[PDB]
Amino acid sequence: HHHHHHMVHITLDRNTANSWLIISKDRRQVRMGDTHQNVSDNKERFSNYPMVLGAQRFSSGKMYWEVDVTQKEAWDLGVCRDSVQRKGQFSLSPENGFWTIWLWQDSYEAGTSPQTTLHIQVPPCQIGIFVDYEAGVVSFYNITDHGSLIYTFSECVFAGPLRPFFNVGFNYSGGNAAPLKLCPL
Numbered sequence: 001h002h003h004h005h006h007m008v009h010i011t012l013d014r015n016t017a018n019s020w021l022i023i024s025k026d027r028r029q030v031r032m033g034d035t036h037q038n039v040s041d042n043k044e045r046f047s048n049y050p051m052v053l054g055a056q057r058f059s060s061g062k063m064y065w066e067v068d069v070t071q072k073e074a075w076d077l078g079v080c081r082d083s084v085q086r087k088g089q090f091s092l093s094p095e096n097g098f099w100t101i102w103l104w105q106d107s108y109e110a111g112t113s114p115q116t117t118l119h120i121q122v123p124p125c126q127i128g129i130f131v132d133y134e135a136g137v138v139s140f141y142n143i144t145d146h147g148s149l150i151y152t153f154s155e156c157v158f159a160g161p162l163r164p165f166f167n168v169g170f171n172y173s174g175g176n177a178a179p180l181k182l183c184p185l
């Protein structure tokens with residue numbers, strides 16, 4: 001792929017984070033803490049899952065960024081509508097305003113409804129995410145495997161401004177503590 005020149009500098013929005021997340025000073029890394037992080041509650045915070053949004057909002061154009069997922073067992077990545085539900089239980093689907101992929105239990109899947117099996121021969125350490133707002137496309141690339149395509153959502157009905165979306169996953173196993181990191185341009 002030749003999407004690298006649409007690179008955008010993404011930072012995480014603390015106010016949207018689940019109350020157990022720890023975001024670095026530079027707002028470029030996030031990990032699951034072992035307890036509540038001593039923040040006040042607000043209507044933006046994801047309550048049920050270890051999720052956070054990027055600060056940036058996109059309503060046009062082409063955007064690209066990269067995320068490091070090294071040594072994680074579970075995570076979700078992609079984009080979502082600014083108006084997604086924050087409280088209670090929900091599934092990651094385009095009907096609910098999410099365009100995502102994930103790792104869970106040693107398999108990769110796209111967040112369609114129902115979910116779609118991904119075919120990845122080289123487990124990725126860094127994921128590239130490309131959004132073409134006008135075309136209605138969200139694509140995912142395997143940076144570890146020379147940029148190979150993982151998945152394309154096409155005919156997307158965004159229906160609002162988009163935000164970068166992250167889930168660091170739970171750490172019930174003790175093997176999923178590692179952070180998500182936004183990689184330098």
Ligand SMILES: CN1CCO[C@@H](CNc2nccs2)C1
Binds near residue numbers: 018020047048050
């Ligand atoms: C009372 N419910 C409502 C909120 O989510 C449920 C568990 N989820 C999380 N706990 C830690 C961080 S995310 C507990």
